[PDB]
Design an enzyme around this catalytic site. Structure first.
Site, PDB file in Angstrom:
ATOM      1  N   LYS A  74       0.852  -1.176   0.000  1.00  0.00           N
ATOM      2  CA  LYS A  74       0.000   0.000   0.000  1.00  0.00           C
ATOM      3  C   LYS A  74       0.894   1.234   0.000  1.00  0.00           C
ATOM      4  O   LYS A  74       1.891   1.284   0.716  1.00  0.00           O
ATOM      5  CB  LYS A  74      -0.915  -0.033   1.218  1.00  0.00           C
ATOM      6  CG  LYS A  74      -2.013   1.010   1.254  1.00  0.00           C
ATOM      7  CD  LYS A  74      -2.826   0.843   2.531  1.00  0.00           C
ATOM      8  CE  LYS A  74      -4.045   1.746   2.605  1.00  0.00           C
ATOM      9  NZ  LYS A  74      -4.852   1.458   3.825  1.00  0.00           N
ATOM     10  N   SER A 148      -9.784   1.371   1.492  1.00  0.00           N
ATOM     11  CA  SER A 148      -8.586   2.170   1.772  1.00  0.00           C
ATOM     12  C   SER A 148      -7.431   1.362   1.252  1.00  0.00           C
ATOM     13  O   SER A 148      -6.706   1.841   0.414  1.00  0.00           O
ATOM     14  CB  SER A 148      -8.378   2.513   3.240  1.00  0.00           C
ATOM     15  OG  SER A 148      -7.260   3.356   3.439  1.00  0.00           O
ATOM     16  N   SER A 172      -9.661  -0.486   7.197  1.00  0.00           N
ATOM     17  CA  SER A 172      -9.113  -0.521   5.863  1.00  0.00           C
ATOM     18  C   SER A 172      -8.346  -1.787   5.525  1.00  0.00           C
ATOM     19  O   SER A 172      -8.025  -2.017   4.366  1.00  0.00           O
ATOM     20  CB  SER A 172      -8.195   0.675   5.685  1.00  0.00           C
ATOM     21  OG  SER A 172      -8.924   1.876   5.863  1.00  0.00           O
TER      22      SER A 172
END
Lengths: 450, 444
Positions: A74, A148, A172
Site C-alpha cells: 500500500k 482504503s 481498511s
C-alpha cells in the site's frame, strides 16, 4: 498458475526459477495497466537484483521463509527506491530505506514489486477516493474494491500477488478483504512497527496483511511482527501472540442482538451472516447476544469525535500550505479537525474510557466476537454520488476496533446470489491474534473440501 | 499522634466519642481557617461513630474504628460542600466519594474538608481564598503542595491521617515540607468517583500520614476497583503488600551534572546523605540521564494536559471566570488556545519520552529523587507565583504522565529546622515494594 504461497513454494521446489516468475509477473502487469491497481512498480532490474541477493543468501544456507515471493505494498508504506505518494499527486517523498516491516519481509526473501493504490491518506473505506483511477471489486467491476487498502486487495484477489500489505485504522485492512473474498489480518496495535508508514491516526494505525488464506496471512504476520525500539507505539509480543492454537470443543462467541443488526437494506447479507452464526454454533460455539450500543458509540468517535485530528496532525503542513492536492472529500474531513479543541480531545478520551468500561461486560462473557465485516457493498456510482454517508455505513462494524485496542481477522463467509462475496470478522482482545486466526481458519475450513 | 496511639488508647478503655469531641473543641478554641474550609458538625460525626460502634458490637471488621481524618476539599464527603477552594463552586454531594466511603465503612470518621490550592492547580498552598496554610516548622514558609491543609492537619497533630490528591505532585510536596509520609498510589488503584477532577487521566487520591505503616494501613482500605470509574483498575492482592528488600539492589539517581536545587545548598547536601544511606542499606547507585523525565514533566504545564483542567471546569471558566484564583485562572484558560492537533502531538511526544525512559528502568529497581528541590517563603511565592511554583515541580510532574508509583518520605532537616524529603518511585503497581524500601530507609 500461481495463487497462494504454497503454489510458489511447490513451483520453486520443482525447479522453476524465481527470476522467470517475476519477469513473467511484470510482463503480465505491463500488457494490462498499472493503474488503477498500481501507482508504481519497482523497476524489473532492481527487483531481479533484490532477488539475486536473496539467492546468494539462500545458497549460504540462510533461512528465508518467503524466498522469491512477490508482494504489493500500500502506497502509504515506505519501499526503498519508490516514491511514497500515499495516493496524492503532490506528496513527493522517496525514502532511502524500507519501512521496518517491509525490511523484515525483504530480509525473509520477499520482493516488493510495487506500490498499490489506496483511498488518499488512508481516509476512506471504499477505494474511490484517489486520483490514480478507481480500483474495482474483482467479482464485478461496477462495485467498489473497498477499503482504503484497495489496490493491495485487488492485486491479491486478481491473482497477481500471493500477499500484500495494507493498513487499518477504521477498517481498511478488512473491508477490502470482505469485498474480494480474501483474508485480512489486522494485528494488535504495536505488534507491527509503524516506522516508514505515513500515519493516518498514529495512535491507531496498524500495517495489515492481505492474503488468500489464514496460514499465508499468519506466515507473513510472523515475519512482519516485531518490536521496533525507534517506534514509540511498538510493543513486545513474542511467539505467544501469533501462535496457532486448537480451540476447545465448546466456547462462547458474542454477536450483537439479531433485532438491531444493521445491514442497510441488504437482506442477502443478513441471511449469510445468520449462516455464519449457525456454522460457528455447529463447531461448538454458544452464541451470546449483546447490546452493540457502546461499540457503536465508540466507533462513532473515530469520525464524529476528536480522533479525526490525528489525520490533520499527520499532514498538517500539507493541509495548510497545499490543500488543493487533497482529494476534496478527504480534504473536508481532515480540515474539519481545525475546529476541534484540546478540551474536545480529552472529553473524547474520557468518553471512550467509559465505553471501554461498558464493553467489559460483554468481554467477560465471551471468548471471541463475531461481526459482519461490511454490512453491505455499494456501486461506484452510488458511492461517488453519496461519498460521506455511504462510506460511514461501511464502517458500522469496524471503526471501534483500534480505538478499543482489539485484534481482528476478517475471513470469507460465502457469496450472494449475484456472485458478490460476504465476509465476517473475528475480534479478540489485544495479543489474541493467533487465537482468533485459529478459529477463523477452522471456520473457513468447515466444511471445506481440500 | 499516629494510628497506634489511637488503637492503644481505645484498647486501654478510652471512649472514641470523647476523643472526637475533644478534637473538635481544640479546633474551635483555635482557628478553622486556614487549615480547614468545612467541619462536619459534631452531632453528625458522633452519629457516624455510633453507627460504627453498633457494627463493631455485631462483630464487624473495622480496622480504622474511631479514627478521625481530614479530606482535601476537592473530594466528596456527604453532608459537606465540596468547594475545591473556590468561593463560587456550588456542589454538596448526596454521597461519600468511593474512597471516603470505604474508609467510613472501616470505621473512620471524616472530621472535615481541608484547604488546598484551588482546583488542585499549584504545588505550594498559597493559591486559595480561605487563608494561606503554613509550614508547621516555620509559619513564614509555604505549607506546600495543593494538598496543603491535609498535610498541616496531620503534621500539627490534629489528625493521624488525611486524604490529598496528586496530579503534578500535590500528594508529595506537602509531605516533604511537613516531615510526613505521602503515599501516591498507582493511577486507578484508588477510585476517582466523587473527586472533582483536575486532570482526570492523571489524578490520584493520595494518603498523608506520619509513617509508612499508617499510610499503607489507609491505602489498603482505600484501594479497590470501582466499576463506575472508567479509569479505575484492578490491582489487589500484592500491590500494597509489604515485603522486605534483598541485601543488594539497584536504585537510580539523576546524574550530578543535571541535578537542580535552585541555589539550595543544604538540600543538595541532605540529598547526598540520603543517597549514601541507601548505599549503606545495600543499594548500588545507578546514574541516569534525567532528560526525558524532565521533558515529560514539562508537558504537564507547557503541553496540552493543561486542557484536562479546563475540560473539568469548562462551564465555570466560561460563565464565571471571576471566582477563579487569578493565577489559576490564567493557567487554566490558556488551554483555550490549544488544539486537538496539539494534544495528539503531545501524546506522540510523551510516548517517545516513555520509550527513552525504559533504558533507565531496565537498569534499576527503584528511582530516588528529591521530593522538592527547595522550599520558599510565602512572601517570595506570592511575589513570583508561577515561576517558583514550577520550580517545586521539577522532580514530581512526570510521575502520573508516565504511569508510576511514588512514596514521599522524610530525609532529615536543614540547620534552620525546615525538613527535607525524598521520594521513591517505581513502576505501576509497585506501591507496596517501594513503601517497604521507604520504611526501611526511614528506620535503619
Amino acid at each position: 498458475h500461481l495463487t497462494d504461497l504454497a503454489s510458489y513454494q511447490a513451483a520453486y521446489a520443482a525447479g522453476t526459477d524465481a527470476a522467470d516468475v517475476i519477469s513473467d509477473l511484470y510482463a503480465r502487469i505491463k500488457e494490462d495497466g498499472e493503474n488503477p491497481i498500481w501507482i508504481s512498480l519497482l523497476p524489473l532490474e532492481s527487483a531481479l537484483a533484490m532477488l539475486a541477493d536473496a539467492q546468494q543468501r539462500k545458497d549460504k544456507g540462510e533461512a528465508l521463509p518467503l524466498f522469491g515471493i512477490p508482494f504489493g505494498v500500500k502506497d502509504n508504506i515506505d519501499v526503498a527506491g519508490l516514491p511514497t505518494t500515499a495516493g496524492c499527486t503532490g506528496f513527493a517523498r522517496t525514502p532511502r530505506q524500507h519501512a521496518f516491516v517491509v525490511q523484515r519481509l525483504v530480509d525473509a526473501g520477499a520482493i516488493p514489486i510495487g506500490k498499490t493504490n489506496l483511498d488518499q491518506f488512508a481516509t476512506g473505506l471504499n477505494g474511490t477516493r484517489t486520483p490514480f483511477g478507481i480500483p474495482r471489486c474483482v467479482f464485478n467491476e461496477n462495485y467498489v474494491s473497498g477499503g482504503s487498502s484497495s489496490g493491495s486487495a485487488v492485486a491479491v484477489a486478481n491473482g497477481t500477488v500471493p500477499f500484500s500489505l495494507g493498513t487499518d485504522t477504521a477498517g481498511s485492512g478488512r473491508i477490502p478483504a470482505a469485498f474480494n473474498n480474501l483474508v485480512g489480518l489486522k494485528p494488535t496495535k504495536g505488534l507491527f512497527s509503524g516506522s516508514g508508514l505515513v500515519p493516518a491516526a498514529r495512535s491507531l494505525d496498524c500495517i495489515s496483511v492481505l492474503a488468500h488464506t489464514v496460514d499465508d496471512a499468519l506466515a507473513v504476520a510472523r515475519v512482519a511482527a516485531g518490536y521496533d525500539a525507534d517506534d514509540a507505539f511498538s510493543r513486545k509480543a513474542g511467539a505467544a501472540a501469533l501462535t496457532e492454537k486448537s480451540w476447545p470443543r465448546r466456547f462462547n462467541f458474542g454477536v450483537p442482538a439479531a433485532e438491531h443488526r444493521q445491514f442497510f437494506g441488504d437482506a442477502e447479507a443478513e441471511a449469510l451472516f445468520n449462516k455464519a452464526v449457525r456454522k460457528l454454533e455447529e463447531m461448538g460455539g454458544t452464541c451470546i447476544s449483546f447490546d452493540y450500543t457502546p461499540f457503536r458509540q465508540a466507533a462513532e468517535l473515530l469520525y464524529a469525535g476528536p480522533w479525526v485530528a490525528e489525520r490533520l496532525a499527520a499532514i498538517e503542513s500539507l493541509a495548510d500550505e497545499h490543500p488543493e492536492v487533497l482529494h476534496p472529500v478527504v480534504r473536508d474531513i481532515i480540515l474539519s479537525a481545525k475546529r476541534m479543541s484540546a478540551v474536545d480531545t480529552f472529553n473524547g478520551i474520557y468518553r471512550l474510557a467509559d465505553l471501554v468500561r461498558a464493553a467489559e461486560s460483554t468481554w467477560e462473557k465471551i471468548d471471541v466476537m463475531l461481526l459482519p465485516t461490511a454490512p453491505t457493498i455499494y456501486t461506484v456510482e452510488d458511492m461517488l454520488a453519496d461519498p460521506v454517508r455511504l462510506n460511514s455505513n461501511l464502517g458500522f462494524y469496524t471503526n471501534f476496533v483500534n480505538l478499543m485496542d482489539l485484534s481482528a481477522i476478517a475471513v470469507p463467509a460465502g457469496f450472494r446470489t449475484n456472485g458478490l462475496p460476504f465476509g465476517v470478522t473475528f475480534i479478540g482482545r489485544a495479543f489474541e491474534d493467533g487465537a482468533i486466526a485459529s478459529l477463523g481458519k477452522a471456520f473457513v475450513e468447515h466444511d471445506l473440501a481440500k
